[PDB]
Amino acid sequence: INTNSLSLLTQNNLNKSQSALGTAIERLSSGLRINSAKDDAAGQAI
Amino acid sequence: AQVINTNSLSLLTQNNLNKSQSALGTAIERLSSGLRINSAKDDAAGQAI
């Protein structure tokens, strides 16, 4: 065995978690639910 | 509801306070001047007659 495929799996999960973490921090900082275009276009326009 | 960007209740109260101030000022001016009419606003026919 050259590599721990389960370690690679864990890395994927790590990024998965971090993305939502960063999103929550974004919203906390801005005091808003929407900070970018790809949050909700209809909400932004309205 | 846990948001800070704008505190709705505050503005609501501000509107009510502005209403109160307008009414209070009108009433105090009426009392002080002793009339009912201090401007064209009060009564058109009243002023004319």
Residues 6+ apart with CB under 8 A from B3: A31
Rounded Cα gap, residues A33 and B1, in angstroms: 12
* CA B39/CA B34 separation, integer angstroms: 13
In angstroms, the first-to-last Cα distance of chain A is 55
Q: Which amino acid is at B21?
A: Q
Distance CA A26, CA A32 (A): 9
Among all chains, which residue has been given the structure tokens 């009339």?
A: B35
Q: What are phi and psi of B32, to 5 degrees?
A: -60, -50
Taking contacts as CB-CB distances below 8 angstroms, the residues of chain A near B7 are: none
Per-residue tokens: A2: 């050259």
Expressed in Å, this structure's resolution amounts to: 3.7
Structure tokens at A1: 């065995």
DSSP B4: -
Helices (H), chain A: 5-30, 41-45
Task: Tally A–B CB contacts below 8 A.
Answer: 4
Experimentally determined by:
cryo-EM
Contact residues, chain B, for A32 at CB < 8 Å: 5
Q: Which helix (H) or strand (E) holds B31?
A: helix B8-33
